[PDB]
Amino acid sequence: GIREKIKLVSSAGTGHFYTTTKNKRTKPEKLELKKFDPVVRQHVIYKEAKIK
Amino acid sequence: GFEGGQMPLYRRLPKFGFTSRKAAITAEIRLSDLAKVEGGVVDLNTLKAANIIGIQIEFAKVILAGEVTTPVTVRGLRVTKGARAAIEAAGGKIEE
Amino acid sequence: PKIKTVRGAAKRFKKTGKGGFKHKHANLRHILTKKATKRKRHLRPKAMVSKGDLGLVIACLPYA
Amino acid sequence: TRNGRDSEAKRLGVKRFGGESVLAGSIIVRQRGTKFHAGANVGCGRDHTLFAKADGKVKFEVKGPKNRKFISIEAE
RNA sequence: CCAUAGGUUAAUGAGGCGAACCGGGGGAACUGAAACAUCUAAGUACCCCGAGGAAAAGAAAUCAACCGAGAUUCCCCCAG
RNA sequence: UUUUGUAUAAUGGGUCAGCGACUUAUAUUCUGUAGCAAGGUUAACCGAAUAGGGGAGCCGAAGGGAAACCGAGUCUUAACU
RNA sequence: AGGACCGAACCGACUAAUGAAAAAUUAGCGGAUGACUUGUGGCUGGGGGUGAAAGGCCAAUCAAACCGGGAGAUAGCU
RNA sequence: GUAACGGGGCUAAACCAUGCACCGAAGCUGCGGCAGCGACGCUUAUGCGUUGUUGGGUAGGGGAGCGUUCUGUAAGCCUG
RNA sequence: GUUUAUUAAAAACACAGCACUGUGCAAACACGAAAGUGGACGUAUACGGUGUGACGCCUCCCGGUGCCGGAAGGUUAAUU
RNA sequence: AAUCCUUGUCGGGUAAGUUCCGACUGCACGAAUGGCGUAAUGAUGGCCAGGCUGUCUCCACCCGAGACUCAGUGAAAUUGAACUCGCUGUGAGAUGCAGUGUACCCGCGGCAAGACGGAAAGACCCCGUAACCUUACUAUAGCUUGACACUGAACAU
RNA sequence: CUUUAAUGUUUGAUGUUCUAACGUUGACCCGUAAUCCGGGUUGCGGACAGUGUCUGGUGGGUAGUUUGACUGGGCGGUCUCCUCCUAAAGAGUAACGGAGGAGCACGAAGGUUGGCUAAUCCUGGUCGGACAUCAGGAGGUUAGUGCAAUGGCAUAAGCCAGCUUGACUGCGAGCGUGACGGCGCGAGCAGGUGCGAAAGCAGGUCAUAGUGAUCCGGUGGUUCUGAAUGGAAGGGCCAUC
């Protein structure tokens, strides 16, 4: 289980976040995907942040 | 709830919710129970007197349950829509 | 003496209109990111207690 | 020994057979590959699980050049 | 050195016994938890001191909830 | 008696007489039965008193929701075919 | 002179065969002026004593005495 | 201790084939009796004509009773 | 010499002797919630503990675990 | 050797010696949990010899005490009930079942093959979620560290 | 701000001395006929020592316990999940039966649109060879599948490329499978997305392993709750560790 977990946070400014896994050795760059925010009820860009 | 040594059904399942202290001082009053009082006016106090709700009861709704025939003046009580309608039909008054 | 309730049982179960018992599902507490969302969603709502273990629950909770 | 292991049995196989009336949604076959293929009014799930998409009678049939088994639903 | 300690008399009271109950000072373990250590058993058993016909407590630096109650003790509820 | 299984060479009994083991209390559920019935029932206590009073309370006639809350609906969800 | 020697009492208990005896008998056996033996009284108390040490002995009881209590401990065993 | 037909014994009283007799069980039938459970129909004292059928039983479940001591009924009734 | 009173008397225990080690006296140590007592009315040629066991000839490793000494740095409690 | 292989091999002792004594690949001696010697001592272990013998070849007889008989007294363990034989089978080792054989009823003295004889709810063995006896876990008396308290005054660095 | 000197005052510690706490199991005196005890005088020691409370260490000295099960007892091996066989042509089915794997990987190795078709061998061809790359053919999946085995796969599920985030949020008729806890498949509906001209497809991956209940907490959001009231703390609900 080398592949650590992270949370994609909503750029909408809501609390909402998705959580997921990524391999931090092979992929140093941050994960940015366009995911559905269900509070805004729109598809927003979600940027990787630390799970904590 | 001993199942051999298997983790019993209660211990398996997660706990939930919390108790409301405000729920213990609320009450529900049938339409049928509005006739049980005296004077044709329904306060909390009146209800208590008539032994319908109980002494530690700060709040009380009137629910559409049973039926009301005599006209009644419900005062300082919550009433549901249906209940209210019933009261109106009966010839009653409602006030906050 | 009065029967004592199993307090844990009380915490975990609530009696319903037809004498059933609702309860929160297991598996939706931690170790979530790996669980598929659909499964999680399914888990969320309260669930009735099954016919098999009903009796045990009843025993636990005499005052309901 | 090195040999005690085995897996839990998966209860695959044909659930409803030829002519059985089914409700839409009902699973006709659990299977590993597409041993049976999806025919008319039958869907194939992500685990190749064939299931009725409509209420009717299950209808197994061989079809096509490869001579493949195809489960359909006859209308009802 | 004065004093005090000490010493000899005198008067008054105490001492010891006793079933349970009562207040205080100490205080287990078996057992249960299907093991076990937190926990339980239980402030129980037991030991010790003291008292009384009863004891203890008792006259709000108490509750309550914006209404009010009005020292302590005991019983039924509240409530498993 | 215990056992898959006992004439068993498996257990127990020398015989007789006497005694010797599913109780009781309080809670809770289900069955029967009697009472009254959208009602039913009182507890302590008072009452020399199994009466009568005492309805403090308890159970029921409404549920849904974690809860606020709503209420024959309600929770879910932005909203439910 | 001597934890010297042979040997009765006295103290013991190596071999033997055999209820009068809950450890004895008879026949032999060891020590016998000593780290000896014995009378009377005293002291040490239970996780405590005492032990030239065997887990020995502590009232015919000892890897934790006896008596009473917790106590109808608990017993998925008979 | 014969001791590898249960024994006697058997040249069939052995084996094969075909046949017809008989024996043979707590099976089936016959006659008599009791009880359970269903059907219908009586017309009732809530069971009766009947009419099918059932009735081995450990753990265990359900149903119905006998007897013992004591209280009432009983200052009754039986009893030198 | 001692020992398993009551299946083991021995090669076991003890022993004089040897060595290590502690202890400066209100000694170490031991029994005591403590007071105190033993050690000892003794004082290092003494007392305690440990091992070895008359007499004779004798009797590499300090890495590990202990003990003794060191305290420069690292780490480190209550407290603040 | 208070050494598996092992009755090692060689020598001595014996007609013959897995033991004993003397010597020569330490499974796995070894120096104060002492090594190697050692006069004396030992109800100490092992081995050999002389003497002695009923220990034995191989038992015989005799003397007493019991055993046996008579009179008196008078136990005990055990015990489902017994009209309580052999064999071969069966049923997992038969007085009791099958087939068969044998056997008139009842004592007394003897013997111990069986009654899985009597005795003690196996001591071995296993099981079950007691007791005593390390660098297991958790505590803790004791010993030890510092901080505050009982605890004060000066002077310097 | 980097860095110090001056005057004024303030804690921390470090020894030297003191004498008055405290010690004295030094001496003498008295209570006293008294090696106890106390008081007195005095010497020595002296703010140490020693006691209490807190605190770290050490602590089988002592105590309370634990020390798994399966097992043709211990030792060895095993314990969850996936594939095959045993398994008797539905499902299921045991053994310390026979054989192998898993405790992940991947922001592309997922979505979608468009395109493509393998191993091996033969013949020819610079270095170049049994085995690189390139031609012509045979072959027909004998290959490939991120990793075991099975069942699948050409409409490819195999191989390339373009654009992308459906590896969406709320739900879910109806089924399957479990004693239950649970696990699985799912058309369709709402919102909002991507690929496509469009029909359509997309709620992860060819499928079947890659996993852990509850409790206790942690983080973010959420006025649901908030013990006189307003807040807050704590609790709940959603997401997550």
mmCIF file with all atom_site columns, C-alpha atoms (C1' of nucleotides) in Angstrom, chain H residues 50-78:
data_model
loop_
_atom_site.group_PDB
_atom_site.id
_atom_site.type_symbol
_atom_site.label_atom_id
_atom_site.label_alt_id
_atom_site.label_comp_id
_atom_site.label_asym_id
_atom_site.label_entity_id
_atom_site.label_seq_id
_atom_site.pdbx_PDB_ins_code
_atom_site.Cartn_x
_atom_site.Cartn_y
_atom_site.Cartn_z
_atom_site.occupancy
_atom_site.B_iso_or_equiv
_atom_site.pdbx_formal_charge
_atom_site.auth_seq_id
_atom_site.auth_comp_id
_atom_site.auth_asym_id
_atom_site.auth_atom_id
_atom_site.pdbx_PDB_model_num
ATOM 1  C "C1'" . U H 1 50 ? -72.947 -41.960 11.881 1.00 0.00 ? 50 U H "C1'" 1
ATOM 2  C "C1'" . U H 1 51 ? -68.947 -42.083 8.155  1.00 0.00 ? 51 U H "C1'" 1
ATOM 3  C "C1'" . G H 1 52 ? -63.792 -42.041 6.558  1.00 0.00 ? 52 G H "C1'" 1
ATOM 4  C "C1'" . U H 1 53 ? -59.260 -42.490 8.526  1.00 0.00 ? 53 U H "C1'" 1
ATOM 5  C "C1'" . U H 1 54 ? -55.511 -42.676 12.230 1.00 0.00 ? 54 U H "C1'" 1
ATOM 6  C "C1'" . G H 1 55 ? -53.485 -44.682 17.276 1.00 0.00 ? 55 G H "C1'" 1
ATOM 7  C "C1'" . G H 1 56 ? -44.446 -47.708 17.600 1.00 0.00 ? 56 G H "C1'" 1
ATOM 8  C "C1'" . G H 1 57 ? -41.856 -43.846 19.979 1.00 0.00 ? 57 G H "C1'" 1
ATOM 9  C "C1'" . U H 1 58 ? -36.214 -40.991 23.027 1.00 0.00 ? 58 U H "C1'" 1
ATOM 10 C "C1'" . A H 1 59 ? -35.231 -35.503 23.326 1.00 0.00 ? 59 A H "C1'" 1
ATOM 11 C "C1'" . G H 1 60 ? -39.086 -32.464 23.276 1.00 0.00 ? 60 G H "C1'" 1
ATOM 12 C "C1'" . G H 1 61 ? -44.121 -29.871 22.445 1.00 0.00 ? 61 G H "C1'" 1
ATOM 13 C "C1'" . G H 1 62 ? -49.555 -30.071 23.356 1.00 0.00 ? 62 G H "C1'" 1
ATOM 14 C "C1'" . G H 1 63 ? -53.981 -32.185 25.873 1.00 0.00 ? 63 G H "C1'" 1
ATOM 15 C "C1'" . A H 1 64 ? -56.737 -34.610 30.126 1.00 0.00 ? 64 A H "C1'" 1
ATOM 16 C "C1'" . G H 1 65 ? -56.638 -36.766 34.980 1.00 0.00 ? 65 G H "C1'" 1
ATOM 17 C "C1'" . C H 1 66 ? -55.487 -39.776 40.000 1.00 0.00 ? 66 C H "C1'" 1
ATOM 18 C "C1'" . G H 1 67 ? -53.818 -39.336 44.825 1.00 0.00 ? 67 G H "C1'" 1
ATOM 19 C "C1'" . U H 1 68 ? -51.519 -36.878 49.389 1.00 0.00 ? 68 U H "C1'" 1
ATOM 20 C "C1'" . U H 1 69 ? -51.522 -32.630 53.533 1.00 0.00 ? 69 U H "C1'" 1
ATOM 21 C "C1'" . C H 1 70 ? -53.746 -28.137 54.696 1.00 0.00 ? 70 C H "C1'" 1
ATOM 22 C "C1'" . U H 1 71 ? -58.302 -23.596 54.242 1.00 0.00 ? 71 U H "C1'" 1
ATOM 23 C "C1'" . G H 1 72 ? -63.415 -22.846 53.280 1.00 0.00 ? 72 G H "C1'" 1
ATOM 24 C "C1'" . U H 1 73 ? -68.155 -25.246 52.537 1.00 0.00 ? 73 U H "C1'" 1
ATOM 25 C "C1'" . A H 1 74 ? -68.351 -27.773 58.304 1.00 0.00 ? 74 A H "C1'" 1
ATOM 26 C "C1'" . A H 1 75 ? -71.096 -25.793 65.415 1.00 0.00 ? 75 A H "C1'" 1
ATOM 27 C "C1'" . G H 1 76 ? -72.631 -29.681 58.760 1.00 0.00 ? 76 G H "C1'" 1
ATOM 28 C "C1'" . C H 1 77 ? -72.096 -35.185 57.849 1.00 0.00 ? 77 C H "C1'" 1
ATOM 29 C "C1'" . C H 1 78 ? -69.661 -40.131 59.720 1.00 0.00 ? 78 C H "C1'" 1
#
